[model samples]
Target: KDFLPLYFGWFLTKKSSETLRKAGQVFLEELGNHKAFKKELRHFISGDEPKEKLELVSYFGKRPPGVLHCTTKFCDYGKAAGAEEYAQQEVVKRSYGKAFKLSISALFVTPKTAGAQVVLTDQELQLWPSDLDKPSASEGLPPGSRASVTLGCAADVQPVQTGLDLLDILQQVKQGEAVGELPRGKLYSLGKGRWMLSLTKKMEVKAIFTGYYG
Candidate 1:
């Protein structure tokens, strides 16, 4: 038997991806121009390096191509423990190709990665894998904890690192001391060069729940 895909996710339409690209550009500019972020950078740099060297755009370079989607299950091509079970779920089959409005609620950045935080609704959560956040299992975060999209990544970083970065920030949230409020929404600090900006107005993206056979 061939088993399932490497993962299952919602692929964004071209217009939606472009919208997010522009939004991400604006957010990066604002974050780079912020005095708070500049001040925080000193802790991560060596002596005499000018602030201009701390460019956010350069830090996260160019965005990669592909359907911008949120992975619901990283099946690892059936090697994942729950791959078969998730693929056979009634909800999964029923929802395939169904359109969903995913709320892109935040933008986050870490030394290793940058990504958009997705706020999954109750209906959307029906497809989220139970073991999505297994890497952060010890943290005991709520369900749908791994809902996010990799906007960009620093040199030599893997795209999957984006999810782990989000998990780190959530762990800080559990501690109740690593976050601050912005005009948008809550901002969480994951210390050692990481930040998350949860937006006040979520970006509703129309997506189709689908899978890639290859």
Candidate 2:
């Protein structure tokens, strides 16, 4: 038998988690009230699905039942590749137990996933894995543009896709997809039934270096 955790990273305290949620709540509430955002809702909902019945703020679960944390690595019970190498990183060992501030630069949700985009500090990047879905430095997008927190996931979508969904929106925009600006953030549609909002105001979360298991 071996001791292996599901992942390792920062875990926000109860108070801090609430703060992040409340901040995002403000945006979601405003999102539900916007006239243009409401009118644009038709693009994200099927013609068969009644548009008047849709609710942006209420569409997602508040948060998962556990402590809100950002995962640094997903070991999958020691079954994931490079799990051993990641577990042995000097930065991970030294940084564990320290507290760090992470910025949630944006919040996004597709039909199946909900997430916060984390703009990690330079120090924070030392602990990040290189091979995550984050694409290479684009000609315009800044670095560490791919890290995020998966707030919730639908039965049909994995939490990892939340990060990927955000990336797809970025990729689409890079390809010259016309995205509109909003007070909340920029609005982008990934075809019917999926929408993304990159928040304008950022929220910071108190996080501690830590580990998590099933």
Candidate 3:
């Protein structure tokens, strides 16, 4: 078949994906267990229900199942802007099937989604689309600002929203302010029940460049 893929990304090794999955679970559990988070979560809910009654896990529910990867271009099967050009890029062709080490620098959560922020290296950046961050450039976010892995998404939320959420948090950080701090990470408030955790120790994961058709 000549059909193009829905996206181009770096898929994590099974071991790496498993490790990150567990780390994400631990992160969410810790956040749920935190007194500060429990207290803060109330502001997100309304209608006279007890604030303490809200359970983070229950509210967010279980994460969706999928391969762990960082999307470089969402081609929408050749329909998205610049999709054809991107698919034809010499660098992209050369990098396909190549191994890459992606640095998961932080974890972030919003009422809408949970994700890991990926810091792409110079080599990896070569395969990144120029317009990846165009939607967020008005906020002065740099290119590749949307680099992230969709750890999970709340009900009815699409996986693509995770990158948008990551960009939202990064724009806040670019302003040089943080709303608060957690025991293991700094928390930045993005309003509307969104929170970001900047992990002190970044997780380095090995992955390979590939295309996802499904």
Candidate 4:
């Protein structure tokens, strides 16, 4: 009575011992050599248990990691010498107006052939559709390709340390509290949407913070 009455339970035939032994031999022979076998083993071992499936971590997915360069647009009026000069001046004014505070983060830019991508450093991982988990050489269009900078903020979440304070700075400039320095740079639009201002290497901003009671 201790043994349950089962007609073909434990006594039923299963995988042949010879087949099991052959499978074990094959597993040992190609354990680390074949990717298919590894994958199969991973799935079989996972079973129906709750587990975490890993998605490729996008390190530089359209947003570089580090100090980010922020550009904010404003209004500036100027006279042009001629039609061509007038157009150039207009672009210049717009670009300077757009140049604002700098931040430590990623800057997103749109490529000429595809979706938006982030630029941090040459070593950062690309998040393009094809390059999600592939090597950098095989990623999306290479950098410096005929890409256009898109306009409109991609995401406007508040920064952890400081958010966009362009309005405050503009007020200061307007009220004469802060003086605007003319920088040597050319503003150009990539025809996509985003505007840019190329500055000379010597042009830079230095900031120092101190706490004192007045």
Find the candidate with the highest TM-score and give its number: 3
The Cα error of candidate 1 at residue 150, in Å, is 0.9
lDDT of 4 at 72: 15
User: Where is model 4 poorest over a 10-residue stretch in terms of lDDT?
Assistant: 4-13
Provide TM-scores for the models. Answer: 0.86, 0.79, 0.88, 0.19
For model 4, the local distance difference test gives 0.22
> How accurate locally is residue 130 in candidate 2, as Cα lDDT from 0 to 100?
55
Clashes within 3 Å, all models in order: 0, 0, 0, 11
lDDT of 1 by residue, 1-214 (tens): 8678888988888889778877776777777666667778866444697757477777788466765888898888899888988998999999998999889978988878888988899999999887543684325787888788888888788888888888877776574443456556666555677777878788988889987776
In candidate 1, position 120 carries an lDDT of: 90
lDDT of 4 by residue, 10-61 (tens): 0101232232223222322322233332333333233463443311112112
Candidate 1 ranges beyond 4 A from true positions: 43-51, 175-190
Every candidate's lDDT: 0.79, 0.70, 0.79, 0.22
Candidate 3: clashing pairs of residues = none
The better candidate by lDDT, 1 or 4, is 1
Please give the range of 10 consecutive residues that has the lowest summed lDDT in model 1.
Answer: 175-184
User: How far does residue 95 in candidate 2 sit from its true spot (Å)?
Assistant: 1.1
Question: Over 4 Å off in model 2, which ranges?
Answer: 132-143, 175-201
TM-score: model 3 vs. ground truth: 0.88
